[PDB]
Design a protein around this ligand. Structure first.
Ligand SMILES: [Zn+2]
Ligand SMILES: [Zn+2]
Ligand SMILES: [Zn+2]
Ligand SMILES: [Zn+2]
Ligand SMILES: [Zn+2]
Ligand SMILES: [Zn+2]
Lengths: 91, 91
């Protein structure tokens, strides 16, 4: 599992460094050839507007794609979160 | 394709009847046995707070799950949308 574990760890670490991110709630990734396709859901402040949340999604996309060049496709979106124990995370 | 086409059509129709939904942007579903597992992203007003958006997600989950009894698992979340031509939809 190490290849995908390493990729997922790097994605989570990069996303969590972006201000406004409240953990990574969901993450799925696959190799296609030597490239990676991934979809992720970050936690965000519930009081953000959806358009403010999306600015966080865009910042996460930039950070993750910039740091991990094998990623060819990344979809980021958000759900509400807080030390939250009511949703999954990689925290 | 008819089995899954029919399911997807029913999911989209049910979701679009919920006030606050601005189209279905993304939808993936699979059978597991005779049951359905699905994940979907709805469009919502960008000026909603994320917590207001989530009330729409919950209303969509109730509507879709209530109308289509074979669905055993449904994850609904949201992205910003408006006659929007900048994101995909089933519109
Ligand atoms: Zn977003
Ligand atoms: Zn964007
Ligand atoms: Zn979720
Ligand atoms: Zn939601
Ligand atoms: Zn909920
Ligand atoms: Zn999307």
């Amino acid at each position: 599992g190490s290849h995908m574990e390493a990729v997922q760890n790097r994605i989570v670490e990069a996303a969590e460094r972006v201000p406004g991110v409240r953990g990574v709630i969901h993450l799925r990734a696959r190799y296609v050839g030597q490239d990676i396709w991934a979809e992720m859901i970050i936690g965000v402040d519930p009081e953000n507007t959806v358009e403010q949340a999306h600015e966080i999604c865009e910042a996460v996309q930039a950070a993750v794609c910039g740091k991990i060049r094998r990623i060819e496709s990344l979809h980021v979106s958000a759900e509400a979160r807080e030390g939250d124990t009511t949703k999954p995370s990689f925290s």
